[PDB]
Symmetry: D3
Subunit: 156 residues, 6 copies
Amino acid sequence: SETERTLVIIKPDAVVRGLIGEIISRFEKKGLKIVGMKMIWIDRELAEKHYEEHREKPFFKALIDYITKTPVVVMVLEGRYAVEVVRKMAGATDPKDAAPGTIRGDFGLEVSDAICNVIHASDSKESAEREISLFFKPEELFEYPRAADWFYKKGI
Amino acid sequence: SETERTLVIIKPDAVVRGLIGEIISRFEKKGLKIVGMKMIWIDRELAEKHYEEHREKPFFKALIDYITKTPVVVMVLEGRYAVEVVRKMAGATDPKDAAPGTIRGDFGLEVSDAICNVIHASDSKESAEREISLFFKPEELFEYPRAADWFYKK
Amino acid sequence: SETERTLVIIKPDAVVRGLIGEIISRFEKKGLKIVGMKMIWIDRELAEKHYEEHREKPFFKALIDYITKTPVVVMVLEGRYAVEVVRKMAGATDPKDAAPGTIRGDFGLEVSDAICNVIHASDSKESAEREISLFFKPEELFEYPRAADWFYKK
Amino acid sequence: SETERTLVIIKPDAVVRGLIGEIISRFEKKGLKIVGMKMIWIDRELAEKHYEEHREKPFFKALIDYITKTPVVVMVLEGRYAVEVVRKMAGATDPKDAAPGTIRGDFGLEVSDAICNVIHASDSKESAEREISLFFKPEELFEYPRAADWFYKK
Amino acid sequence: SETERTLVIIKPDAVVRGLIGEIISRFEKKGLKIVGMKMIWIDRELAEKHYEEHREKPFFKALIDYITKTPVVVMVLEGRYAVEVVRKMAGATDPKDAAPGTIRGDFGLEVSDAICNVIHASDSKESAEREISLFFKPEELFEYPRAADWFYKKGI
Amino acid sequence: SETERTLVIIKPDAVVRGLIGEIISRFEKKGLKIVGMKMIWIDRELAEKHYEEHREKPFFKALIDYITKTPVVVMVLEGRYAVEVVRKMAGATDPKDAAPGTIRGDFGLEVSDAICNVIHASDSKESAEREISLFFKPEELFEYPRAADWFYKKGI
Ligand SMILES: Nc1ncnc2c1ncn2[C@@H]1O[C@H](COP(=O)(O)OP(=O)(O)O)[C@@H](O)[C@H]1O
Ligand SMILES: Nc1ncnc2c1ncn2[C@@H]1O[C@H](COP(=O)(O)OP(=O)(O)O)[C@@H](O)[C@H]1O
Ligand SMILES: Nc1ncnc2c1ncn2[C@@H]1O[C@H](COP(=O)(O)OP(=O)(O)O)[C@@H](O)[C@H]1O
Ligand SMILES: [Cl-]
Ligand SMILES: [Cl-]
Ligand SMILES: [Cl-]
Ligand SMILES: [Cl-]
Ligand SMILES: [Cl-]
Ligand SMILES: [Cl-]
Ligand SMILES: [Cl-]
Ligand SMILES: [Cl-]
Ligand SMILES: [Cl-]
Ligand SMILES: [Cl-]
Ligand SMILES: [Cl-]
Ligand SMILES: [Cl-]
Ligand SMILES: [Mg+2]
Ligand SMILES: [Mg+2]
Ligand SMILES: [Mg+2]
């Protein structure tokens, strides 16, 4: 199955700037399905867990202050090769490097002690699975049809 | 006290058509704050609690089927006179009657045995209170600053 | 029978300014279905047939010149109460009078010897029938499903 | 003489929130012409001249603080009945009262000790004249063709 | 003359999803001129003719079912180097590979038995001429000025 | 300081086509700050000064006629690495080559005797300084906070 799920976090800079809907519309427009979503306020413990791979890096602390600065919207996107697709849609990590057309390329630039880059997107299928489990319980993820789902069915 | 909170439900028809982001952006652009939000799939019991006032109407059952058809996004919006403002933004109950510019006016039209109208909005501060308590726990509602909040203070 | 068809003409002024896509998207977003559509250049004879009701008005000639000025896009839209809905979406005949949110309200203003107002919309089911027969053959009108058609059925 | 000019001020609240381009595009899309425009920071003396009619109102001081809070974009728009049209596009003075579709309706809501409403628009041809003379010299206003100007001539 | 014409087909997935206007707006915004356009329902015979170059390929049949699934909107775009430009605007054949900013990059992803990719765009000047002739008669293509045409005239 | 200022000129083709607001919105959306802006009608003398580096090139004259054809909107953009960022946002000099997503990629294509390309963007920090000084007096450039400025402050 080419169908997979990735985790997206609309970071504090996007929420504060009122970019939630515009970010969501890009995924819906692409044809990606939102199977799970909710606004939460990430606490230090969960933040460090999500970014446990950066535990031993200089910028770590700035990154924690950042993702926990205000509530965020975490969501699970479902679709064909969603992980690489959503990663492509996100753009380069540093928004100034992200190309015009991507989420970071159009909405990101300014930074604090952390490289504020609009959203988070699972980098691999493996990370996707770990991160989705860290923010969502099975009961929060749903299976339902989007309008055009019928159109793509593999013949008879 | 002009700042109030209202409960909005992005109904199954909007979720299916991929209109969640567009509806949300209208509120963010208005200056309204999202203090709570989550995708959930409402069951008949909860749906009937939310729509209690319509239990004696002919269209009740079709309304419950409709609101429970697929997942929805329930959210709480905060801002100056949020309740009447969101209701103003929503438009007439029957999409064909909603004026261009409103959410129901621009996105709604087609119906089933229920009058599909994109979103739900609390009709009073009292109703919003009741509706928010049905879908959220205080721990799911947040107090934080939006970018321009400082511009209006003092 | 709430499903009806209406004839819309994206007038020369909209075609020239590159507003075809924006006008079409408003209908698609409303939930209306495009069952027919083609770019054509109307000649005086056909233009006068379409505008028969105005043959005795002072602005008739300028209206024919206007509608035949450049190519236009004629199209048929299908949906619940399509006729009154599209008319609602269009707005007042004179763009300066059309409310913000409507197509004439947002895109129209400037005029010539004719009141240039972006698009034309049938004013009744009877008129739509007549107007569609003027521009299309049954073979140019289609019956097919739009993505969310299933959501409203049964 | 239907072509007129009106003075619009994109107020501090719109400049701060990054709404300058969106407000301008609404006018360009309507068919209105920008014949003058510049970002400036109004001082109390000039602000009070612009708002002379309100010197005896309770909210005067807060209005001057507001309009002089940060830089603004003052601009002159030209077009058929520009004054009433822009006022129509702006919407009710109090954003909560402005209808969806209007600039104040879509972008305004929150207030301070002043009713923050995104933009200012001359209320008459006479007022526009006065207001334009306050912010521009004839050398800052231009006469040039917009892309579709030819479509409406002759 | 740098001015040329290419054929664009807003495939069934775009029509069904209500993306006709948004696709048209991108070309109009670019400055391209629509000289011909119409909604038709492509029959097997015409579809196989249009895609006669893929006649001897595996995916052929899936492609035919696809382009003939529902009505489509065929249109002729005119403008400076329109063929390469419109091809660039379209994005990579498989939507998941198309870059954010292109038509396939923003609107395409999911596939059926066919690689559903929003629109069709002539790949060469030669193909453009053959395809335009296959869908449009000379009487359906017009010559008229767009608003800003006067602005680009080559001095006196 | 990563913070810098670049000069942008919304050329005559953009003004005539009513693209001023859409071009401005892209920079505001990116997070760039407009510290100076005004509509002017560039005279030959100032135009040749701005493009003094192309004085000894063939296309020079066409370029002058172009930028002075109608009023333009000149503005000063402020933000982190604004010069390279705005240059990236602009796209390739010839609009047909600019990628979908950039300003020239989405709005530019047709040309006159000059390669009409929507806007001008300082190519270097050095050019930025010379050009900004050529169109703006210190009194026309302001320092004020944008809504989200507080969010990016470097911790305590
Ligand atoms: N007459 C009706 N027939 C079928 N469904 C209806 C009817 N009236 C309302 N509905 C549905 O029930 C919902 C709630 O009804 P009501 O509260 O009266 O409208 P509103 O959502 O504007 O407050 C409506 O939004 C619509 O989804
Ligand atoms: N008084 C007028 N002077 C010039 N042109 C007019 C006038 N009234 C209407 N028109 C033009 O004739 C068209 C058809 O007229 P009418 O059917 O009355 O308006 P509508 O298009 O809203 O149904 C109008 O859309 C406009 O293009
Ligand atoms: N009652 C009020 N209290 C505070 N501020 C107000 C009040 N009324 C108006 N204002 C502010 O003063 C501005 C000018 O007032 P007025 O001219 O009456 O409204 P308008 O801008 O719609 O012409 C309003 O746009 C708003 O910014
Ligand atoms: Cl990138
Ligand atoms: Cl869908
Ligand atoms: Cl309404
Ligand atoms: Cl804000
Ligand atoms: Cl109206
Ligand atoms: Cl649909
Ligand atoms: Cl209003
Ligand atoms: Cl124009
Ligand atoms: Cl690509
Ligand atoms: Cl044009
Ligand atoms: Cl580029
Ligand atoms: Cl900001
Ligand atoms: Mg109710
Ligand atoms: Mg009529
Ligand atoms: Mg006033």
